[PDB]
Amino acid sequence: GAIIFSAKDIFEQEFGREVRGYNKVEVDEFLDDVIKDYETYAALVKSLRQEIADLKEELTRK
Amino acid sequence: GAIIFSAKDIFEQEFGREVRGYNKVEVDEFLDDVIKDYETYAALVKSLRQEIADLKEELTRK
Amino acid sequence: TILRRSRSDRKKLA
Amino acid sequence: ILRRSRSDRKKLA
Ligand code: NI
């Protein structure tokens, strides 16, 4: 589908280390919130597409 | 609303550097995909919620 | 939730 | 310019 990652992928993603790399705590606490948005967005599109399917079922029948 | 970040926030996010941090190019390439996912999800939700509004307007009327 | 990437013991799974 | 990438934010110099 059109989405690259799941929330689980954001949590499981590994990175190499380098000298003068990004502060891991800061990246991780930022990715905490990214993960929460992946969960919210996944739930939102599911809720919405399911509701649409129900409305079309109602509309297209007697 | 329930979403924490926009794609814009992913793009703008900065991290300090620490002595043995995450590889920056890898974090940034990863976040570029996250940006794309936020763009995609935001567009999907806008379109789905408008479709729903329009189908309900149709269903609930003569 | 369980997917808190900043969990101190994330390394136990990922 | 029409598709945001974080490498567009690397130092110019
Ligand atoms: Ni509704």
Author numbering:
A (entry chain B), B (entry chain A): -1 to 0, 4 to 63
C (entry chain C): 27 to 40
D (entry chain G): 28 to 40
The paper states:
GpsB has emerged as a major regulator of PG biosynthesis in low G+C Gram-positive bacteria, and its homologues (DivIVA/Wag31/antigen 84) in Actinobacteria play essential roles in hyphal growth and branching. To gain molecular understanding of GpsB function, we report three crystal structures of PBP cytoplasmic mini-domains in complex with GpsB, the first structures of a PG synthase in complex with a cytoplasmic cell cycle regulator. The PG synthase arginine finger pokes into a negatively charged cavity situated between α-helices 1 and 2 of GpsB and is fixed in the same orientation in all structures, just as the phosphoryl group defines the binding orientation of peptides to 14-3-345. Therefore, the role of GpsB in the bacterial cell cycle is that of an adaptor, docking PG synthases to other cell wall enzymes, scaffolds and shape determinants into protein complexes for division (the divisome) and peripheral growth (the elongasome).
Synthetic lethality studies in pneumococcal ΔgpsB suppressor mutants revealed that pbp1a, and not pbp2a, became essential in the absence of gpsB indicating that SpPBP2a is the class A PBP regulated by SpGpsB in S. pneumoniae. We found that the cytoplasmic mini-domain of SpPBP2a and many of its orthologues contain the consensus sequence (S/R)RS(R/G)(K/S)xR that resembles the Bacillaceae PBP1 SRxxR(R/K) motif. In this instance, each subunit of the SpGpsB dimer is peptide-bound. Peptide binding principally involves two arginines but each SpGpsB subunit recognises the peptide differently. The importance of SpPBP2aArg31 and SpPBP2aArg33 is further supported by their sequence conservation and FP. Although SpPBP2aArg31Lys had only a 2-fold reduced affinity, which probably reflects the ability of SpPBP2aArg33 to compensate for the loss of SpPBP2aArg31, the binding affinity of SpPBP2aArg31Lys,Arg33Lys was reduced >25-fold relative to wild type. The arginine complements the cavity best when the mainchain amide protons of it and its downstream residue are accessible to form hydrogen bonds with BsGpsBAsp35, LmGspBAsp37 or SpGspBAsp33. This scenario can occur when the arginine is either at the start of an α-helix, such as BsPBP1Arg8, or at the i + 1 position in a type I β turn, such as SpPBP2aArg31, which explains why free l-arginine does not displace pre-bound PBP peptides from GpsB even when present at 100-fold molar excess. The interaction was lost completely with SpGpsBTyr23Ala, SpGpsBVal28Ala, SpGpsBAsp29Ala, SpGpsBLeu32Ala and SpGpsBAsp33Ala mutated proteins and reduced with SpGpsBIle36Ala.
